[PDB]
């Protein structure tokens with residue numbers, strides 16, 4: 001893939017991808033969407049699929065720009081937060097990589113900070 | 121058809137007793153009349169249906185289960201089967217996978233290369249293979265036993281699989297091995313499972329449950345594969361993915377399984393009945409610690 005190779009050549013894979021989306025690029029494909037009972041609580045990144053009927057659930061590594069582009073993650077001492085877990089996004093979404101890159105997980109309740117988190 | 125709603129089909133026992141001649145497979149259903157739930161990759165459906173079948177067996181499922189997944193990569197560089205296994209297996213299960221070519225996976229460790237060079241020397245509780253090489257098959261007029269990665273699979277069963285462990289090995293009409301079939305005689309139970317989603321394919325999963333390390337039955341591998349093809353030749357399935365809408369019970373439950381580093385001299389009558397129930401795995405008990413496991 002051309003965009004993944006551009007991302008891997010660049011200092012900031014996230015910026016490179018998001019700029020590319022904004023410029024008309026077509027989203028990363030082949031994200032691994034799981035089958036689940038959609039009876040989950042709806043948290044963002046979970047040990048097992050946790051989607052509500054409002055969400056899709058994805059294999060974490062397949063929606064991680066750094067994993068997909070084969071470049072080191074931002075924290076070289078740590079481990080990818082997505083790989084080995086499952087990522088819940090709105091059920092329609094066609095660009096799950098973008099969604100993951102532009103939202104933040106509340107660190108106490110575990111939901112996305114996009115109107116699902118209720119803390120503070 | 122009602123049968124479209126199960127995860128798939130397993131070889132009827134009677135076929136396992138036949139002496140079928142080897143013949144080409146001919147399925148009645150090559151038009152592939154099955155739809156997949158929206159946005160769903162074929163191998164996600166396939167692996168999910170395989171795990172649905174394995175949910176009905178006496179799989180030994182302990183804490184710190186060791187699972188090896190060979191042939192986990194795709195041409196698109198992701199690992200759909202490994203994602204399903206990660207969803208399926210209990211939290212804290214050590215899932216390690218492998219493929220010839222680089223790919224990105226939700227396993228705790230991935231090794232790129234010939235499975236033969238896999239650098240881990242531990243004993244495993246469950247080995248899944250989807251390894252497959254297209255049309256680089258043994259040429260000739262005869263469908264004969266193949267020796268590729270199957271040689272390695274047989275070696276892992278003989279030396280690197282805990283007593284009580286299980287395997288599920290992808291085979292097709294041409295991609296099969298006679299010794300692997302014979303080794304299924306060393307398990308408490310063995311079958312071939314064909315997923316409903318891929319019913320239009322000779323693909324089957326050759327499954328052994330609860331390894332005993334002793335031949336419980338004697339299987340001529342060459343005859344057995346012919347028997348499997350004869351079964352595919354004398355049954356007609358629509359195919360289907362309806363079982364994928366029943367996911368409430370999907371996750372594999374801890375089975376009530378103990379791990380004991382028993383000696384070969386302590387494998388008595390009780391041990392064996394425990395092995396056949398999925399209640400006991402015999403191997404070293406230490407937690408295998410991988411660098412990439414969030415511990």
Ligand SMILES: Nc1ncnc2c1ncn2[C@@H]1O[C@H](C[C@@H](N)CC[C@H](N)C(=O)O)[C@@H](O)[C@H]1O
Nearest residue numbers: 163191193200201219220234235250251252269
């Ligand atoms: N000796 C071998 N060692 C390791 N992998 C192999 C070997 N031979 C074939 N393979 C792999 O078997 C795989 C067959 C694939 N169709 C597997 C699809 C994959 N399981 C999925 O979830 O989509 C290829 O990726 C091969 O690289």
Ligand SMILES: [Zn+2]
Nearest residue numbers: 064066067080
């Ligand atoms: Zn990553």
Ligand SMILES: [Zn+2]
Nearest residue numbers: 106109117119
């Ligand atoms: Zn919150």
